[PDB]
Design an enzyme around this catalytic site. Structure first.
Site, PDB file in Angstrom:
ATOM      1  N   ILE A  67     -32.122   4.248   5.994  1.00  0.00           N
ATOM      2  CA  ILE A  67     -32.421   2.862   5.657  1.00  0.00           C
ATOM      3  C   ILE A  67     -31.362   1.922   6.236  1.00  0.00           C
ATOM      4  CG2 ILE A  67     -32.589   1.243   3.733  1.00  0.00           C
ATOM      5  CD1 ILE A  67     -33.873   3.587   2.145  1.00  0.00           C
ATOM      6  N   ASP A 113      10.648   6.343   9.252  1.00  0.00           N
ATOM      7  CA  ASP A 113       9.431   7.056   8.880  1.00  0.00           C
ATOM      8  C   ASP A 113       8.544   7.290  10.105  1.00  0.00           C
ATOM      9  OD1 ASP A 113       7.478   8.202   7.302  1.00  0.00           O
ATOM     10  OD2 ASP A 113       6.785   6.298   6.414  1.00  0.00           O
ATOM     11  N   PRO A 122       5.203   8.148  12.449  1.00  0.00           N
ATOM     12  CA  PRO A 122       3.755   7.984  12.317  1.00  0.00           C
ATOM     13  C   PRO A 122       3.082   9.322  12.084  1.00  0.00           C
ATOM     14  CG  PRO A 122       4.590   7.022  14.371  1.00  0.00           C
ATOM     15  CD  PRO A 122       5.671   7.892  13.813  1.00  0.00           C
ATOM     16  N   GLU A 148      -2.537  -1.032 -17.967  1.00  0.00           N
ATOM     17  CA  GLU A 148      -2.056  -0.536 -16.681  1.00  0.00           C
ATOM     18  C   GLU A 148      -0.882  -1.359 -16.155  1.00  0.00           C
ATOM     19  OE1 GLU A 148      -4.095  -2.004 -13.395  1.00  0.00           O
ATOM     20  OE2 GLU A 148      -2.192  -1.451 -12.495  1.00  0.00           O
ATOM     21  N   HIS A 149      -0.935  -2.682 -16.293  1.00  0.00           N
ATOM     22  CA  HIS A 149       0.239  -3.489 -15.968  1.00  0.00           C
ATOM     23  C   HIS A 149       1.423  -3.114 -16.851  1.00  0.00           C
ATOM     24  CE1 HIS A 149      -1.204  -6.901 -13.288  1.00  0.00           C
ATOM     25  NE2 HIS A 149      -2.230  -6.077 -13.382  1.00  0.00           N
TER      26      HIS A 149
HETATM   27  O1  LIG Z   1      -3.048  -5.755 -10.029  1.00  0.00           O
HETATM   28  C1  LIG Z   1      -2.818  -4.607  -9.881  1.00  0.00           C
HETATM   29  C2  LIG Z   1      -1.795  -4.197  -8.845  1.00  0.00           C
HETATM   30  C3  LIG Z   1      -0.460  -4.497  -9.532  1.00  0.00           C
HETATM   31  C4  LIG Z   1       0.159  -3.285 -10.253  1.00  0.00           C
HETATM   32  C5  LIG Z   1       1.463  -3.692 -10.960  1.00  0.00           C
HETATM   33  C6  LIG Z   1       1.392  -4.385 -12.179  1.00  0.00           C
HETATM   34  C7  LIG Z   1       2.562  -4.780 -12.831  1.00  0.00           C
HETATM   35  C8  LIG Z   1       3.834  -4.470 -12.274  1.00  0.00           C
HETATM   36  C9  LIG Z   1       5.045  -4.864 -12.934  1.00  0.00           C
HETATM   37  C10 LIG Z   1       6.266  -4.539 -12.325  1.00  0.00           C
HETATM   38  C11 LIG Z   1       6.255  -3.840 -11.107  1.00  0.00           C
HETATM   39  N1  LIG Z   1       5.122  -3.490 -10.522  1.00  0.00           N
HETATM   40  C12 LIG Z   1       3.910  -3.793 -11.085  1.00  0.00           C
HETATM   41  C13 LIG Z   1       2.709  -3.399 -10.405  1.00  0.00           C
HETATM   42  N2  LIG Z   1       0.455  -5.035  -8.558  1.00  0.00           N
HETATM   43  C14 LIG Z   1       0.822  -4.406  -7.439  1.00  0.00           C
HETATM   44  C15 LIG Z   1       1.741  -5.286  -6.787  1.00  0.00           C
HETATM   45  C16 LIG Z   1       2.434  -5.076  -5.459  1.00  0.00           C
HETATM   46  N3  LIG Z   1       3.846  -4.834  -5.618  1.00  0.00           N
HETATM   47  C17 LIG Z   1       4.811  -5.744  -5.020  1.00  0.00           C
HETATM   48  O2  LIG Z   1       4.474  -6.701  -4.407  1.00  0.00           O
HETATM   49  C18 LIG Z   1       6.275  -5.396  -5.204  1.00  0.00           C
HETATM   50  C19 LIG Z   1       7.198  -5.554  -4.173  1.00  0.00           C
HETATM   51  C20 LIG Z   1       8.536  -5.209  -4.353  1.00  0.00           C
HETATM   52  C21 LIG Z   1       8.910  -4.692  -5.576  1.00  0.00           C
HETATM   53  F1  LIG Z   1      10.195  -4.336  -5.820  1.00  0.00           F
HETATM   54  C22 LIG Z   1       7.982  -4.529  -6.583  1.00  0.00           C
HETATM   55  F2  LIG Z   1       8.388  -4.020  -7.763  1.00  0.00           F
HETATM   56  C23 LIG Z   1       6.661  -4.877  -6.418  1.00  0.00           C
HETATM   57  N4  LIG Z   1       1.821  -6.344  -7.591  1.00  0.00           N
HETATM   58  N5  LIG Z   1       1.050  -6.201  -8.656  1.00  0.00           N
HETATM   59  N6  LIG Z   1      -3.437  -3.598 -10.721  1.00  0.00           N
HETATM   60  O3  LIG Z   1      -4.358  -3.978 -11.709  1.00  0.00           O
HETATM   61 ZN   LIG Z   2      -4.057  -6.011 -12.046  1.00  0.00          ZN
END
Ligand SMILES: O=C(C[C@@H](Cc1ccc2cccnc2c1)n1cc(CNC(=O)c2ccc(F)c(F)c2)nn1)NO
Ligand SMILES: [Zn+2]
Ligand SMILES: O=C(C[C@@H](Cc1ccc2cccnc2c1)n1cc(CNC(=O)c2ccc(F)c(F)c2)nn1)NO
Ligand SMILES: [Zn+2]
Lengths: 958, 956
Positions: free
Chosen positions: B296, B853, B855, B69-70
């Site tokens: 409960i 945006d 609300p 997923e990552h």
């Molecule tokens: O852990 C999890 C949740 C993971 C999912 C994930 C995993 C890998 C990644 C690789 C590259 C890009 N996104 C990814 C997201 N997650 C979510 C966040 C929150 N995003 C930010 O903070 C953020 C801010 C500004 C940006 F421009 C930006 F790209 C990100 N960070 N990790 N699932 O198992």
């Molecule tokens: Zn994760």
């Protein structure tokens, strides 16, 4: 072999009796022209001083020019034939670390100055010409009449001045006692012009008739030997001419039989309730070795158990009482019993007075008491043995006054040492205190509307009535009252005067000998004065002393009630040279105990104990709350310039509850709410203390821990956290901004102004820039703004210091409107710029030396040294060596340094000008060029004003 | 008609208040699809749910589906620029996330409505041809490892996994789902596994179109949406994968009648009672498990919790069915424990089975179920409009469980009563099927086992059969009684007509010494709900640590007291929150307006006449004590943000100060405190919703009157309504404050570049700069350098001042993190000058969409206004004016602002840094050279040596 008479000296006195602790050397003498002289040699003194007292005053004003003596006294500062520059005298003193003043009473005009010890002769020479060749310049006279007018206007709406002249107006109108001494523009200019009087001639005529050497006493104090001081005084004063003027005497009392058994009803300006009981008495001056009048004042005025006041207070009628002999003039005196009045008291004046005559009757019944006289003599003897060393300026002045009344060899002791027990004289005076000789005055707003007379100089509204003979008879028939007992022996009289030897670990400045959560103890064993005394200073911090108006009110009433209940007990200590003070502050409470160390621990323990186990009497609570309510309201009647300063503090401090806020919150203070507040306030505390005097390190620690232990046992006190020990910061003004805050004074018909040029936080650099600049403009601003432009009587310039910040301030009280005063102050600043640029490097270095002498002037008495240290401590700067450091730095300043400072911070165009002005309007409200000023930003709301600006840091501790 | 569409669903049933348009359809490749047309939305969104998750990990590679997923974020065969997806989103006012559960992997994004296709195209490739780049794979393994690291010392994760570890080891339910560097790299390397091959294999095997559901929300017509979803997704290959089942329950009979004693990290005392139950998902239309959980887990009179609480044993209780997987579920009853409760766990559980026994005796109650049915129906009808991103992700998850026409309603609208199912489930809730876990530090040093993945210390033992039997013989207990008919059920849903002088923004309709009353009649949403917001200002709420403790305990005790009465209201959509603040008290009542005045008067009335129950006071005081200590176990980056807030605020009491003052709170002291607190007040309120101006004044008046009558309240002075300032840092200053986290073996850092007071220009410089560095910061400090899992950049706003802030939690030292952020700032300087004018304008547009945006629901609008009110700025039209100004900003404005305020050589740089060291704490672009930092040793000294900012001027 017989001696060699100097012909300028009629005689040299024998040894002048002095305290064995007094290291100054003394010589008295009488000049050939009759001037009486005391020379004081003190090789340590940093400042020298001289005073001359002429035994003529406003009782000898010409009947058609009220105030002439007083006016003449002003004019003698304004130039002489030998030194014709109008401000030579003031300018000379200011540039040599000096100052001067003078005052005119009914029988005396008293002139004095101090100056750097190197410049006595130059100061004395300019001084002497006052009494030989005044110019009475016609232009100067036309200007200075305004200062005198302004001085009188200051007093018009002041209740003590009004009451002082009303008494003079209710006696014999043909008696000099009835004259008006201040004078004003009407009596010194207006009327004399209507009448074709030439006032400059009247000045010359009065100077010549009364400024006779035979009515003159001079005192000179300097580093020089007695022999050199003698030559100096002979050289300078031998030529005052002796016109053998007889000394005025007033053998007929101003209150004759038709002025007795009178009752006066008076309307005050403030909301106050006073009762004044007066008896005429003979002149007691010549009995100074027995002092029958003070014997009776000691008793009738006593505040201990059994006293007159104690019963009047238990009855809920009076809170304070003053009793004893009052000065009059050569030939007559008074005896007074004055009290303030509760609401009930105002309805029971007749009973109050009956109680007075019952107390007097108790004294008749017991007869004079040698043991009482003995205590007075013993306490006086001790007070004189261990008298604090005086500042020279006040000392020369005082002594010049009393050389007229005592043999040379007794001038120092005459007012302290009693010698003769005179039960005959005590009975003589007591016999004058009788209902058939009494005068009674009641001061209350409740007479507003019901008066039918007007005193002419002040406008006082009053009614006069004869006391009904049945009232007089009921007072004459006072039978004994068992509540009245003479005082018992004073057990606070000190006996241990031992001076503890200097501990090996002693320090030149206070040391931090204890540093805990609860308490931070600063300690110094006295190493200079060696008198059996100590000062104990305690700052208690609590957040709950100032968190909101209501709590501030409760902190005030707690300490007022506490002092009120300790009063009977602590009076014996007061009489015995041991006194204390207890105020609330914006951080908590302040407690000070001063005097003979002997029995200090007993009084201090009694005070702390009573704090921690407070028991409020509801009757006192109601009475003291009512008085406090009036006190808040009566602030409306203070001087315009006092209002100006008060509003500035409000504007520039982070938190500050106003009189109106306090007053509004005061109604919700209930006895239960106060009872709950005291333990809350005492529950958490920090204690910072200075203990300084005739005490060891162990005693100091024991004293500190005793205060601690008492609070812990009885109030369960615990420490505050360090993050709770916060201080109020000063508002930080924006560069080149200029704010104005305007209010009106609804009582006085003058305006007031304070102008504050904020500079920067305090630091060695910035302090000495500001102080040197203030030294350079000090005399010029007074001479320009008052002497020449005559903007008002009250004119002031100098450093303002608050919450670790500082700046330059001008204060003026004036008939003109504030906006005018601004432009005149700005005009003055401009001129000073050229003045400093053109100043020679010699002149600049002269002002540096002036300032250095002032800053390095060592303190003369323990209290002065304590106060220095205490300032370093409550400012939390802890910079005890500050004077050496800052003077050292000052001596490296250059006039370029000062001009850069002025142009950066103060000049009208300066990039970092921070100007705030408070304008207090009056109740009804060529020249050098004033610069053009920006449009000022007008503060309507202090809260918004502060919310919109940053807040300065606090200074770093040392 | 169209070959790519297998079927087009019928009318999708929705709420009559829902103006969005819906179309369902199934793709020829088996992808279930819901399309959502909303011509008003500012952001569009899509989400995709794959019915595969951690339960299907290879047994020899824990965490593969999570790691996969990552990896899907890091490039596809069509968009191979590693950060193309994130960059496209960031430059178009979008964002994205994803999670892996046991049977689902769920991906979603939102984006400016004018750029749905470009976002969705890039999105779709995740499920067509990911690169699984080897380089990227070796970097991202660290993000997953860091993600697991933040959980390791978190008590909720330890217990989560400990349950799995105490079931059948052979069951997928026991798998470690997060993965870490050990399971995703180190061990596969030493065992010869090619992780990249395994990712490709997993993706090919399970990312099949037959297991996917897709939801898309945009402004386009449903037709255009259908064409767009066909274009991008019918490509997905279908491998007809069987949906995994788990028929055998992870707890067999050797796992039952078991007792576990567990040592926590924080000082907490918990009791967890679990029963295995059959999968109940198919019964969702009658929902037996929820019926039983409702009873409960009830908190009203006669409830199980009510008696456990009055015996002083328990404070909170949770009960009901807990998800598991296709094939198995659980029923739980979890309580926290008082000190006495910890000594009476045996009896607590007896009381549990007594309440279960009474439900058996009464048998099922259709009126209960009918009440639930009718309340859910009302809740569905007036459901607030959701934000797109969360809505698409939610729906995509449930499309797998319900038919298309009913997917919006299936979770809300109960059908017919099935007492047989209730009796069936209830039959599982018996002592012989029970699992019991006690969590208490009192077991420290008394345990003999260690859970592998988190290290949890525990002990396992069988429940003695004499104890099972006593529970089996549970008598009926007179203290237990079914709930009464909910008296808070709302019945007046009339929407009052817009008054003729209604305002678009809140209007100051009352302004006395005691009350500022802000009012607005709802004119967007027209639901029968209202929000009522009150700040009670008092100087005594926060004057010293003792008084702050007492404000807290007062409101906790008050809520504890009101809870039985307010639970009915909560169940009927009428809720409130009451909490102490540094200026006084905050009270919020939200929900159906019908019965609001009843609840509000009750609350104000109990505030002003409160009578403390001593036993509650002791219990809540002890819990508060533990709460203050337990902060030690929070996470390093949390500790960082807490220290910064302490440093930069005028007044702020620390946990040690609060904790020491706590022993001095006595019952008498607290009783004296409350009248003092209430004695003088100022009330600022926002009343917003289905209410008229007259009604609002009436509510404000009832509040004032109740306080005046019972607490004798009177107004504060204007000069007492003061707010705290922010420390003003010196030009070119750099301060560092260092602390240790004793619990976690990571470090945290917050870096604050304070700029200046809030104002239109300074606000938009900082926000535009934030917008420009947002994605590059994440990509550099996380994706490329892999400093840690938590990486954040953005604005900081406190007390009218603002600045730029970086937050990072890492295994690297706090000072190393410093230089990497400084390095990143330099590279950003080049990027901004190299940036084209069209790129710059993209960033302006992205920030403009975000700021403008609108609300979607009343609470969101309410909160926007409330923020203007408590901050005392009252700038209700801020977004328009600030966006207008934003559009005039030029790229050179931003460069000038950076070199003046932010650059390492900036003349007005104002830098403070909080360094939280790990427990055992002591090419690449070049970091600049850094000044010597001024090291803060004492917050008090630090603050007593600097100026304080002004406060911001109100707008009007
Ligand atoms: O852990 C999890 C949740 C993971 C999912 C994930 C995993 C890998 C990644 C690789 C590259 C890009 N996104 C990814 C997201 N997650 C979510 C966040 C929150 N995003 C930010 O903070 C953020 C801010 C500004 C940006 F421009 C930006 F790209 C990100 N960070 N990790 N699932 O198992
Ligand atoms: Zn994760
Ligand atoms: O009223 C009184 C008291 C009068 C006496 C008096 C009368 C006229 C004077 C004319 C010129 C100079 N001094 C005069 C003094 N008095 C006292 C003061 C106090 N002096 C200053 O503030 C001051 C500060 C800094 C200076 F550089 C400076 F010269 C003065 N002001 N008036 N007696 O009846
Ligand atoms: Zn005068």
């Amino acid at each position: 072999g017989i001696p060699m008479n100097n012909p300028a000296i009629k005689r040299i006195g024998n040894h002048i009796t002095k305290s064995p602790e007094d290291k100054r050397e003394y010589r008295g003498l009488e000049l050939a022209n009759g001037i009486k002289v005391l020379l004081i040699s003190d090789p340590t003194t940093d400042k020298s001083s001289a005073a001359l007292d002429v035994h003529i005053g406003s009782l000898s004003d010409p009947p058609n020019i009220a105030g002439l003596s007083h006016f003449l006294e002003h004019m003698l500062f304004l130039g002489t034939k030998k030194y014709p520059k109008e401000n030579e005298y003031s300018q000379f003193l200011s540039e040599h670390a000096g100052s001067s003043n003078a005052f005119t009473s009914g029988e005396h005009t008293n002139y004095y100055f101090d100056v750097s010890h190197e410049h006595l002769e130059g100061a004395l020479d300019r001084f002497a010409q006052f009494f030989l060749s005044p110019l009475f310049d016609e232009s100067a006279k036309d200007r200075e009449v305004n200062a005198v007018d302004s001085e009188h206007e200051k007093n018009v709406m002041n209740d003590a001045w009004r009451l002082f002249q009303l008494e003079k107006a209710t006696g014999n109108p043909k008696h000099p006692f009835s004259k008006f001494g201040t004078g004003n523009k009407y009596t010194l200019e207006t009327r004399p012009n209507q009448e074709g009087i030439d006032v400059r001639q009247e000045l010359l005529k009065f100077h010549s008739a009364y400024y006779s050497s035979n009515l003159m006493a001079v005192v000179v104090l300097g580093r020089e030997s007695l022999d050199d001081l003698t030559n100096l005084v002979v050289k300078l004063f031998s030529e005052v001419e002796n016109k053998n003027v007889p000394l005025p005497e007033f053998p007929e009392h101003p209150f004759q039989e038709e002025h007795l058994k009178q009752l006066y009803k008076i309307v005050p300006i403030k909301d106050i309730r006073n009762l004044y009981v007066t008896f005429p008495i003979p002149d007691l001056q010549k009995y100074y070795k027995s002092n029958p009048g003070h014997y009776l004042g000691h008793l009738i005025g006593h505040e201990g158990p059994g006293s007159l006041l104690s019963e009047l207070k238990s009855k809920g009628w009076v809170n304070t009482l003053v009793g004893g002999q009052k000065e009059g003039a050569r030939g007559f005196m008074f005896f007074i019993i004055n009290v303030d009045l509760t609401e009930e008291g105002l309805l029971h004046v007749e009973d109050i007075i009956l109680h007075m005559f019952q107390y007097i009757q108790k004294l008749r019944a017991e007869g004079p008491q040698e043991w009482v006289f003995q205590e007075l003599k013993d306490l006086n003897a001790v007070a004189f043995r261990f008298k604090d060393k005086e500042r020279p300026r006040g000392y020369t002045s005082k002594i010049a006054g009393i050389l007229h009344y005592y043999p040379l060899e007794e001038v120092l002791t005459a007012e302290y040492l009693l010698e003769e027990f005179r039960p005959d004289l005590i009975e003589m005076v007591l016999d004058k205190l009788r209902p058939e000789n009494v005068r009674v005055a009641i001061v209350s707003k409740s007479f507003e509307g019901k008066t039918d007379r007007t005193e002419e100089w002040y406008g006082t509204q009053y009614k006069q009535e004869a006391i009904p003979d049945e009232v007089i008879k009921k007072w004459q028939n006072a039978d004994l009252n068992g509540k009245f007992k003479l005082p018992t022996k004073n057990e606070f009289i000190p006996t241990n005067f031992e001076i503890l030897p200097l501990e090996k670990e002693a320090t030149p400045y206070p040391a931090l000998i204890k540093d805990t959560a609860m308490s931070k103890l600063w300690f110094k064993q006295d190493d200079k004065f060696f008198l059996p005394k100590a000062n104990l200073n305690f700052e208690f911090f609590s957040p709950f002393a100032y968190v909101d108006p209501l709590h501030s009110n409760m902190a005030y009433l707690y300490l007022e009630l506490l002092k009120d209940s300790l009063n009977e007990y602590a009076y014996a200590a007061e009489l015995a040279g041991l006194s204390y003070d207890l105020q609330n502050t914006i951080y908590g409470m302040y407690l000070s105990v001063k005097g003979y160390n002997d029995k200090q621990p007993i009084l201090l323990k009694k005070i702390i104990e009573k704090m921690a186990t407070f028991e409020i009497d509801e009757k006192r609570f109601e009475i003291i709350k009512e008085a406090y309510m009036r006190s808040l309201n009566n602030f409306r009647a203070e001087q315009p310039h006092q209002h100006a300063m008060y509003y500035l503090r409000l504007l520039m401090t982070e938190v500050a509850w106003t009189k109106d806020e306090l007053k509004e919150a005061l109604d919700d203070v209930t006895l239960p709410r106060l009872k709950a507040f005291i333990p809350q306030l005492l529950s958490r505390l920090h204690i910072e203390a200075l203990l300084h005097g005739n005490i060891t390190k162990q005693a100091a620690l024991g004293i500190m821990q005793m205060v601690e232990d008492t609070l812990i046992e009885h109030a369960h006190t615990k420490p505050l956290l360090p993050s709770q020990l916060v201080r109020y910061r000063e508002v930080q003004l924006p560069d080149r901004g200029w704010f104005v805050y305007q209010q009106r004074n609804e009582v006085h018909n003058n305006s007031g102004i304070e102008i504050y040029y904020q500079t920067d936080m305090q630091s060695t650099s910035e302090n000495m820039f500001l102080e040197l600049f203030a030294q350079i403009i000090s005399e010029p601003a007074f001479n320009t703004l008052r002497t020449k432009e005559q903007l008002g009587y009250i004119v002031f310039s100098g450093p303002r210091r608050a919450n670790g910040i500082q700046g330059l301030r001008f204060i003026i009280q004036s008939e003109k409107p504030p906006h005018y005063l601004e432009s005149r102050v700005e005009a003055f600043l401009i001129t000073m710029e050229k003045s400093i640029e053109d100043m020679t490097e010699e002149a600049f270095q002269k002002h540096i030396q002036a300032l250095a002498i002032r800053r390095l002037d060592k303190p003369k008495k323990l209290s002065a040294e304590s106060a220095k240290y205490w300032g370093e401590i409550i400012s939390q700067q802890y910079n005890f060596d500050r004077d050496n450091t800052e003077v050292a730095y000052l001596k490296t300043l250059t006039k370029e340094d000062i001009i850069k400072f002025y142009k950066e911070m103060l000049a009208v165009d300066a990039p970092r000008r921070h100007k705030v002005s408070v304008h207090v309007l009056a109740r009804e409200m060529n020249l050098s060029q004033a610069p053009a000023l920006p449009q000022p930003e007008v503060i309507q709301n202090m809260t918004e004003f502060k919310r919109g600006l940053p807040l300065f840091p606090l200074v770093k501790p040392h």
